[PDB]
């Protein structure tokens with residue numbers, strides 16, 4: 001998928017987790033976010049004029065998705081343990097990772 | 107100063123900005139945060155076993171303070187224009203930069 005679709009998948013599923021009632025719903029939404037993050041990691045930020053994969057800022061862009069995936073995996077661990085409220089709180093702590101990349105590259 | 111003192115300078119002055127009443131108080135607190143950020147940038151995160159300055163994660167650590175300084179400068183621009191509420195809102199958007207580095211390195 002393109003960057004807009006992957007970002008709206010992250011966006012929508014973050015809200016699904018917030019309103020979820022059980023661990024299966026949380027787990028399903030996190031699993032979809034993980035895939036969207038790894039897909040988005042293959043893209044480049046539009047406003048970044050230098051798109052070189054070896055450039056420090058493209059390293060930083062891809063690295064940000066590795067951090068997000070790691071936090072998604074932390075939340076999935078809690079969901080798989082049945083800890084729904086804890087997993088929802090872990091998903092809330094994703095937001096600063098989203099907002100940080102956005103402020104930096106948009 | 108050491109890392110703890112610089113971090114508590116960032117912490118305390120973020121609160122000063124929140125409770126400030128005029129542009130001079132906001133400007134003064136942001137100016138002190140800027141200095142603390144550049145000082146902290148010379149340190150290393152304790153839990154990072156590899157302290158090599160050329161290593162990707164030390165590059166990332168120093169880069170995070172460049173981003174924070176840039177956001178501080180954005181807030182200072184607003185404070186210097188007399189835009190107190192706007193500068194306070196810009197300072198609130200620093201928090202995700204703080205929380206992001208913390209989750210990544212602590």
Ligand code: HEC
Nearest residue numbers: 003007010011014045046061064065068094097098101105
């Ligand atoms: C964390 C869970 C999130 C969430 C919920 C979103 N993102 Fe991102 N994002 C990145 C870039 C470069 C853009 C700009 C895309 C463009 O200009 O075409 C975006 C954009 C968004 C949007 C806006 C979509 C729109 O309608 O314009 C939304 C809703 C969104 N994102 C959600 C880059 C990144 C990251 C790089 C490391 C990371 C991490 C995130 N975004 C994280 C998230």
Ligand code: HEC
Nearest residue numbers: 109113116117120151152167170171174200203204207211
């Ligand atoms: C943004 C404005 C902030 C604010 C308010 C704080 N930080 Fe940081 N911070 C970083 C590291 C590696 C540590 C660990 C230090 C250690 O283990 O000795 C910290 C710690 C803190 C604290 C806790 C102090 C304590 O009593 O233990 C506080 C209150 C704090 N910080 C405030 C690293 C970074 C960054 C690196 C790029 C950035 C940016 C920030 N911190 C940003 C902020």
Ligand SMILES: [Zn+2]
Nearest residue numbers: 004005007008
């Ligand atoms: Zn959209």
Ligand SMILES: [Zn+2]
Nearest residue numbers: 057060104169
């Ligand atoms: Zn960067």
Ligand SMILES: [Zn+2]
Nearest residue numbers: 060064166170
């Ligand atoms: Zn980063």
Ligand SMILES: [Zn+2]
Nearest residue numbers: 110111113114
């Ligand atoms: Zn302290």
Ligand SMILES: [Zn+2]
Nearest residue numbers: 063163166210
């Ligand atoms: Zn890193």
